[PDB]
């Protein structure tokens, strides 16, 4: 099969700055009919791929002028003259000259931006969940950058350990931030056995850690 | 737009 | 406009077969190749094969020749792919894609497993100071995927739907949150719409302050 080798694998770039992705095929993509069946695709998270460039250099309808493609033979480049926030995702080259058609491994384009401290929100377990026999206490860190943060739980001033799990969103296509959810899991009995639940948040944008809490 | 002529790849015109 | 609309998610047992559909509109179905593509973390995007609906000509990737069969129904402008002798390595998202991959379907999630479907438990996340947040917890379901919207999709500003996370004990969970002006609390309608098609679980949960 024709191997499609993309570089780089990750592209970290600041808004308004140029960027480029290269693709190497193990066989020339020039077909006997004179065309070079090389395309570029973009896939955002949980969405289908979308074609951006075809036949090396032709732009699909609605694709911004900031995108150009070039190359010949085995070596091709996708160029973005200025990255906007909505360009984030995974870019793939793909060839349809040789059977089987093949794709590159993908290049993730992520965006750099200024530090943004998280807004923090705490949620107690719903009466519905408690009535159902278990308890989840949730802390939300919203619209922050960079992705790294620390979340610590306290229950009646007892610092917790080994009973929380965090999940992070993909980077936001408008403001390039992230959001994070932390779920503290206790049995219903352990939850009703205590009073004060608090989540303490440390982040590079906070001079001092931020605590949100509720009394059961 | 499509082309009834079958070609190696379609919808490139 | 060109539209490729795929059939819904599937849970199937090892050794079984499944047939996925791709219903097309907006162009003359007979005059465009239709490709099928597999996406698996790990394996990336893989081309399965293609069919020309005008005469049924097929090209297969040798890797999938003993696994996949491509057919079309011209009368309904629909393309089909049957996958047989299924194993866990066939768990993936499958896409139909037209011509030189110029238009794509929305994908079909296939899970190959001996497990039964389990619908999610949907719980509100309600507040107990300019901005407030609310959400829903979508807990302990199997298999993927679930879809979540707010107010049937009419509310999108401030919405964050977190990725599904596979838990150590075999089930998935996710959450969706919305940040809103604190004034909107207790006065505006917030309904989280959860659909888990494999278990035929649809939930519309109104989220209110406690
Ligand atoms: Cl998109
Ligand atoms: Cl369909």
SS3 C193: strand
Same domain membership, residue A24 and residue A87: yes
What's the length of chain A?
216
Instruction: Order across the sheet with A4-7: list the strands.
Output: A4-7, A19-25, A75-80, A67-72
Among A176, A24, A183, A28, residue whose Cα is nearest residue C140: A183
Six-digit token string for C41: 């973390």
Are the Cβ atoms of C99 and B6 closer than 8 angstroms? no
Give me ligand 2 centre to Cα C76, in Å. Answer: 10
- Dist. CA C177–CA C136, nearest whole Å: 7
Same domain membership, residue A78 and residue A157: no
The number of distinct structural domains making up chain A is: 2
Nearest-CA distance B13 → chain A (Å) = 11
C204: which strand partners? C193
Same domain membership, residue A104 and residue A127: no
Give me ligand 1 centre to Cα A158, in Å. Answer: 45
Same domain membership, residue A207 and residue A129: yes
Give me ligand 1 centre to Cα A89, in Å. Answer: 9
Residue pair A102/C40 in contact (Cβ under 8 Å)? The answer is no
A110: which strand partners? A12
Alpha carbon A1 to chain centroid, angstroms = 31
**Which residues of A sit within 8 Å Cβ distance of B?**
31, 33, 35, 37, 54-55, 96
User: Ion ligand 1 — residues with CB under 5 Å?
Assistant: A 44, 47, 50
Same domain membership, residue A136 and residue A177: yes
When CB atoms are compared, the residue of C27, C54, C98 closest to B6 is C54
- Dist. CA C111–CA C89, nearest whole Å: 9
CATH number of the CATH domain containing A38: 2.60.40.10
Nearest-CA distance B12 → chain A (Å) = 9
Name the residue range of residue C67's domain: 3-112
Residue showing tokens 């309808």: A61
Q: What is the DSSP string of C45-113?
A: EEEEEEEETTTTEEEE-GGGTTTEEEEEEGGGTEEEEEE-S--GGG-EEEEEEETTTTEE---EEEEE-
Name the residue range of residue A72's domain: 4-112
The number of distinct structural domains making up chain C is: 2
Six-digit token string for A38: 């090389």
Among A195, A201, A193, residue whose Cα is nearest residue A122: A201
Same domain membership, residue C199 and residue C137: yes
Cα dihedral C191/C173/C130/A196 (nearest 10): 120
Same domain membership, residue C200 and residue C140: yes
- Dist. CA A4–CA A75, nearest whole Å: 10
CATH number of the CATH domain containing C152: 2.60.40.10
Given A112, A146, A161, which residue is the final one in a domain?
A112
Six-digit token string for C9: 């998610």
Torsions phi, psi of A163, nearest 5? -135, 25
Same domain membership, residue A138 and residue A93: no
Given A83, A112, A141, which residue is the final one in a domain?
A112
- Dist. CA C192–CA C177, nearest whole Å: 9
Given C80, C112, C144, which residue is the final one in a domain?
C112
- Three-state SS annotation for chain A: CCCEEEECCEEEEECCCCEEEEEEECCCCECCCCCECEEEEEECCCCCCEEEEECCCEECCCCCCCEEEEEECCEEEEEECCCCHHHCEEEEEEECCCCCCEECCCEEEEEECCCECCEEEEECCCHHHHHHCEEEEEEEEEEEECCCCEEEEEECCEECCCCEEEEECCCCCCCCCEEEEEEEEEEHHHHHCCCEEEEEEECCCCCCCEEEEEEC
Nearest Cα residue in chain C from A167: C162
Are the Cβ atoms of C32 and B6 closer than 8 angstroms? no
Using CA atoms, how far residue A5 sits from A9, A86, C33, C59, C155, in Å, is: 10, 25, 26, 24, 41
DSSP 8-state class, residue C115: P
The string over C162-197, giving b where at least 16 C-beta atoms fall within 10 Å of a residue's C-beta and e elsewhere, is: bebbeeeeebbbbbbbbbbeeeebeeeebbbbbbbb
Please name the method used to determine this structure: X-ray
Peptide bond into C56 cis (omega under 30): no
Same domain membership, residue C185 and residue C149: yes
- Dist. CA C77–CA C25, nearest whole Å: 7
A150: which strand partners? A202
Six-digit token string for A199: 């989540």
Instruction: Give residues with Cβ within 8 angstroms of C60, minimum separation 6.
Output: C48, C49, C68, C70
Given C89, C112, C135, which residue is the final one in a domain?
C112
Same domain membership, residue C108 and residue C12: yes
Are the Cβ atoms of C46 and A103 closer than 8 angstroms? yes
- Dist. CA A13–CA A112, nearest whole Å: 6
Using CA atoms, how far residue A138 sits from A122, A199, C57, C179, in Å, is: 6, 9, 54, 15
The string over A108-136, giving b where at least 16 C-beta atoms fall within 10 Å of a residue's C-beta and e elsewhere, is: ebebeeeebbbbbbbbbbbeebbeeebbb
Six-digit token string for C109: 């999630």
Resolution at which this structure was determined, Å: 1.7
Instruction: Give residues with Cβ within 8 angstroms of C133, minimum separation 6.
Output: A121, A123, A140, A142, C125, C127, C177, C178, C179, C180
- Dist. CA C78–CA C6, nearest whole Å: 9
Peptide bond into C143 cis (omega under 30): yes
Residue pair A155/A193 in contact (Cβ under 8 Å)? The answer is no
- Dist. CA A203–CA A133, nearest whole Å: 34
Given A112, A146, A168, which residue is the final one in a domain?
A112
Torsions phi, psi of C141, nearest 5? -120, 165
Using CA atoms, how far residue C11 sits from A66, A156, C36, C108, C166, in Å, is: 42, 44, 19, 11, 16
Residue pair C88/C12 in contact (Cβ under 8 Å)? The answer is no
Nearest-CA distance C164 → chain A (Å) = 9
Among C50, C93, C88, C87, residue whose Cα is nearest residue C69: C50
- Dist. CA C208–CA C210, nearest whole Å: 6
Same domain membership, residue A211 and residue A160: yes
Same domain membership, residue C91 and residue C7: yes
Among C41, C70, C36, C38, residue whose Cα is nearest residue C53: C70
């Amino acid at each position: 099969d024709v191997v499609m080798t993309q570089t780089p694998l990750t592209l970290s770039v600041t808004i308004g700055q140029p960027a480029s992705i290269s693709c190497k095929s193990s066989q020339s993509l020039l077909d006997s009919d004179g065309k070079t069946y090389l395309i570029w695709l973009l896939q955002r998270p949980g969405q289908s791929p979308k074609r951006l460039i075809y036949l090396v250099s032709k732009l699909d309808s609605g694709v911004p002028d900031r995108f150009t493609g070039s190359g010949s033979g085995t070596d091709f480049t996708l160029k973005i003259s200025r990255v906007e926030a909505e360009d984030l995702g995974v870019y793939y080259c793909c060839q349809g000259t040789h059977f089987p058609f093949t794709f590159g491994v993908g290049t993730k384009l992520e965006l750099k931006r200024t530090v943004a401290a998280p807004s923090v929100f705490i949620f107690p377990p719903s009466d519905e969940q408690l009535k159902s026999g278990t308890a989840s206490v949730v802390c939300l860190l919203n619209n922050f950058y960079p992705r790294e943060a620390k979340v610590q739980w306290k229950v009646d001033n007892a610092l917790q350990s080994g009973n929380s799990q965090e999940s992070v969103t993909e980077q936001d296509s408008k403001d390039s931030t992230y959001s994070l959810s932390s779920t503290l899991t206790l049995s219903k009995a352990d939850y009703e056995k205590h009073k004060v639940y608090a989540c303490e948040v440390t982040h590079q944008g906070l001079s001092s850690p931020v605590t949100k809490s509720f009394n059961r | 737009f499509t082309n009834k002529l079958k070609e190696k790849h379609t919808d490139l015109g | 406009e060109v539209q490729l609309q795929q059939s819904g998610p599937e849970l199937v047992k090892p050794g079984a077969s499944v047939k996925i559909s791709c219903k097309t509109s907006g162009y003359t179905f007979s005059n465009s190749w239709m490709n099928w593509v597999k996406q698996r973390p790990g394996q990336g995007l893989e081309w399965i094969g293609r069919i020309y609906p005008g005469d049924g000509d097929t090209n297969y990737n040798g890797k999938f020749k003993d696994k996949a069969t491509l057919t079309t129904d011209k009368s309904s402008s629909t393309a089909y792919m049957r996958l047989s002798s299924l194993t866990s390595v066939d768990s993936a998202v499958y896409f139909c894609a037209r011509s030189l991959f110029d238009y794509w379907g929305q994908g079909t999630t296939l899970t190959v497993s001996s497990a039964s479907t389990k619908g999610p438990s949907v719980f509100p996340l309600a507040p107990s100071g300019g901005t407030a947040a609310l959400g829903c917890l979508v807990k302990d379901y199997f298999p993927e995927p679930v879809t979540v919207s707010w107010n049937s999709g009419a509310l999108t500003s401030g919405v964050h739907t977190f990725p599904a996370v596979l838990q150590s004990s075999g089930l998935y969970s996710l959450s969706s949150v919305v940040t809103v002006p604190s004034s909107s609390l207790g006065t505006q309608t917030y309904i989280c719409n959860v659909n888990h098609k494999p278990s035929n679980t649809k939930v519309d949960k109104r989220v209110e302050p406690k």
